[PDB]
A paper describes a structure:
Another heme b containing protein class with a novel type of nitrite reaction is the nitrophorins (NPs) that originate from the saliva of the blood feeding insect Rhodnius prolixus. At least five isoforms appear concurrently in the insect saliva, termed NP1–4 and NP7.13,14 The biological function of the ferriheme b NPs has been established as an NO transporter. Interestingly, NPs were found to be able to convert nitrite into NO via a ‘nitrite-only’ mechanism with the stoichiometry of the nitrite disproportionation reaction. In summary, the key factors that facilitate the nitrite dismutase reaction of NPs have been established to be the heme ruffling and an extended H-bonding network at the active site which helps to keep the proximal His residue neutral.
In a previous study, we showed that the NP4(D30N) variant has almost no nitrite dismutase activity, thus concluding that Asp30 is a key residue for its activity. Inspired by this result, we measured the EPR spectrum of the nitrite complex with NP4(D30N). Interestingly, it shows a significantly increased ratio of HALS species (≈60%) compared to that of the wt NP4[NO2–]. It shows that nitrite binds to the heme iron in an N-bound nitro form like in the cases of NP4[NO2–] and NP4(L130R)[NO2–]. The two mutations D30N and L130R, however, dramatically interfere with the distal heme pocket in the sense that the Asp30···water···water···nitrite H-bonding network of the wt protein is disrupted in both cases. In the cases of the nitrite complexes of NP4(L130R) and NP4(D30N), a negatively charged proximal histidinate—resulting from the perturbation of the H-bonding network in the distal heme pocket—would lead to a weakened Fe–Nnitrite coordination compared to that of the wt protein due to the trans effect or electron–electron (anion–anion) repulsion. In line with this are the slightly larger Fe–Nnitrite bond distances observed in the complexes of NP4(L130R)[NO2–] (2.1 Å) and NP4(D30N)[NO2–] (2.1 Å) compared to that of NP4[NO2–] (2.0 Å) (compare Fig. 3). Similarly, NP4(D30N) was reported to have a lower redox potential than that of the wt NP4 (–429 mV for NP4(D30N) vs. –384 mV for wt NP4 at pH 5.0),70 however, it cannot react with nitrite, which clearly argues for the role of the H-bonding network of NPs in determining the nitrite dismutase activity.
Author numbering: 1 to 184
Write the structure that this text describes.
Amino acid sequence: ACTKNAIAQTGFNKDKYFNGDVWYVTDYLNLEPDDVPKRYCAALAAGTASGKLKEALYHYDPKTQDTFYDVSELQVESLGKYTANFKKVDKNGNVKVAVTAGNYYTFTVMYADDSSALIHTCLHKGNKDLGDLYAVLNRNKDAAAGDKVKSAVSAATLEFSKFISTKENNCAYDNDSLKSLLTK
Ligand code: HEM
Ligand SMILES: O=N[O-]
């Protein structure tokens, strides 16, 4: 289960974050042991469509090849803090698993600037018992974490040395599909 009430960035700029562009996960920290594979890759696009906040997600396991996409409409809890019902889709936006109650994640943007972000997410999926996940994001694939986001990790009282890097995994990203999915 999740245990953290993540605090959103003071002065979070939603229009800049939800601009339709892609964010790559470069480093992550799951608070629950063995909750996720130690080698993994993920990216998301965040944008608006008809005034609705949307995210499209991409997960890729570089070992098993398990690959999936999701689309979510985000509902606002407060500035920088959202609740998202996800539907699993193929890369084209075709629905594979419909939205259902109890299938949702929370999403909190703890820090963001032009090129980087620190987020917290808590995933709820059926009767699975999942824990908190922090992720360092960058606009550039596999970019080393800069001083601003690393300082934000510290300011959140987290130890960046504990984060697991995705940068060394052989991962490819379909950034074009992520951007197109925002409308789906
Ligand atoms: C490298 C970072 C991440 C890792 C290692 C990771 C790991 C995983 C794993 C292992 C699953 C499968 C869970 C299951 O089916 O039992 C999963 C599903 C999921 N994750 Fe992540 N994740 C990451 C980043 C993210 C982010 C940033 C978000 C939200 C912004 C997210 C949202 C979701 C959602 C919505 C599902 C379920 C999708 C579906 O079943 O259709 N993940 N993740
Ligand atoms: O571990 N996916 O939120």
